């Protein structure tokens, strides 16, 4: 409610400012994906709407590391911008919640 | 099973599949292709000459990995990387490391023309007739969708219209506008 | 037309298609040489 919206909405804009301030940062390390993933509404996404999706065997030029559950980086594709890359421990967290 | 693998930020460009390398036939066909990409993308490419077999991670581990980490250095400044590798003759030959290079597959559209190329190289390559056609067949046995860039064009400009435009479509994929 | 028909259905199409392809594959093979040795 009103006491829950004071801290949850001030985290979305603070993670959006970190997302805007990483597009000009140089590419640190790129990864090769093995499985497929698309963003969902319950994935604890920091800025709801700006997450990216990858299928099996895609490439992700990771710019920086936002937290322990989301990386910041872009898709290797014409016109694609930065986005929220799920970490391997976030990909470890998402499958075990499908069982519990 | 790890889902993410540490690959370079700019994939190294490699050429393979005309036939077996280590001959006057296959290498001198590729040497014409290294000349085109040297001056067309001059200032935004890093072209090297590869010596040690990088399909091993013969040479030890240290002499190969110090050359793999040199490819890791050539991806830091966000420019194109090109490899003159002399023993690469298979798609899955470079499937086990953490590089994932660009598999430009030179396609000879007719197998009979290769052994006419062989008799044009004198009698030095005429002693090596059927041994080149083995991996010329085996690369033709490999599926073309497993590769990256296919060149079936006899003339210079038509193999080079693909060789420039595909990586120019790949450069704009890696690099976003401001 | 009838005469053309007796030739082309017998074997004469592949005599002019191969050697026009085996020439344009020859010049592509010799362009891979002449840039190589040249450069």
From Swiss-Prot, chain B:
Keywords, ordered alphabetically: Calcium, Calcium channel, Calcium transport, Cell membrane, Ion channel, Ion transport, Membrane, Phosphoprotein, SH3 domain, Transport, Voltage-gated channel
Keyword Phosphoprotein: yes
GO CC annotation, single: T-tubule
GO annotation terms (biological process): calcium ion transmembrane transport; positive regulation of muscle contraction
This protein's record includes keyword Acyltransferase: no
Listed GO MF terms: voltage-gated calcium channel activity
PTM summary: The N-terminus is blocked.
Subcellular locations according to the entry: Cell membrane, Sarcolemma; Cell membrane
Subunit composition and interactions: Regulatory subunit of L-type calcium channels that consist of a pore-forming alpha subunit and auxiliary beta, gamma and delta subunits. Interacts with CACNA1A, CACNA1B, CACNA1C and CACNA1S. Component of a calcium channel complex consisting of a pore-forming alpha subunit (CACNA1S) and the ancillary subunits CACNB1 or CACNB2, CACNG1 and CACNA2D1. Identified in a complex with CACNA1C. Identified in a complex with the L-type calcium channel subunits CACNA1C, CACNA2D1, CACNB1 and one of the gamma subunits (CACNG4, CACNG6, CACNG7, or CACNG8).
Family the entry assigns: Belongs to the calcium channel beta subunit family.
Functional note: Regulatory subunit of L-type calcium channels. Regulates the activity of L-type calcium channels that contain CACNA1A as pore-forming subunit. Regulates the activity of L-type calcium channels that contain CACNA1C as pore-forming subunit and increases the presence of the channel complex at the cell membrane. Required for functional expression L-type calcium channels that contain CACNA1D as pore-forming subunit. Regulates the activity of L-type calcium channels that contain CACNA1B as pore-forming subunit.
The name this protein goes by in its record: Voltage-dependent L-type calcium channel subunit beta-1
Species name: Oryctolagus cuniculus
Entire-sequence positions represented here: 265 to 461 of 524
Curated annotation (Swiss-Prot), chain C:
Tissue specificity of this protein: Detected in skeletal muscle T-tubules (at protein level).
Residue segments, region Binding to the beta subunit: 20-37
PTM text: Phosphorylated. Phosphorylation by PKA activates the calcium channel. Both the minor and major forms are phosphorylated in vitro by PKA.
Compartments where located: Cell membrane, Sarcolemma, T-tubule
Coiled-coil regions listed in the entry: none
Function: Pore-forming, alpha-1S subunit of the voltage-gated calcium channel that gives rise to L-type calcium currents in skeletal muscle. Calcium channels containing the alpha-1S subunit play an important role in excitation-contraction coupling in skeletal muscle via their interaction with RYR1, which triggers Ca(2+) release from the sarcplasmic reticulum and ultimately results in muscle contraction. Long-lasting (L-type) calcium channels belong to the 'high-voltage activated' (HVA) group.
Similarity comment text for this entry: Belongs to the calcium channel alpha-1 subunit (TC 1.A.1.11) family. CACNA1S subfamily.
Subunit structure: Component of a calcium channel complex consisting of a pore-forming alpha subunit (CACNA1S) and the ancillary subunits CACNB1 or CACNB2, CACNG1 and CACNA2D1. The channel complex contains alpha, beta, gamma and delta subunits in a 1:1:1:1 ratio, i.e. it contains either CACNB1 or CACNB2. CACNA1S channel activity is modulated by the auxiliary subunits (CACNB1 or CACNB2, CACNG1 and CACNA2D1). Interacts with DYSF and JSRP1. Interacts with RYR1. Interacts with STAC, STAC2 and STAC3 (via their SH3 domains). Interaction with STAC3 promotes expression at the cell membrane.
Entry remark concerning the domains of this protein: Each of the four internal repeats contains five hydrophobic transmembrane segments (S1, S2, S3, S5, S6) and one positively charged transmembrane segment (S4). S4 segments probably represent the voltage-sensor and are characterized by a series of positively charged amino acids at every third position.
Full protein name: Voltage-dependent L-type calcium channel subunit alpha-1S
Species for this entry: Oryctolagus cuniculus (Rabbit)
Shown stretch of the complete protein: 338 to 376 of 1873
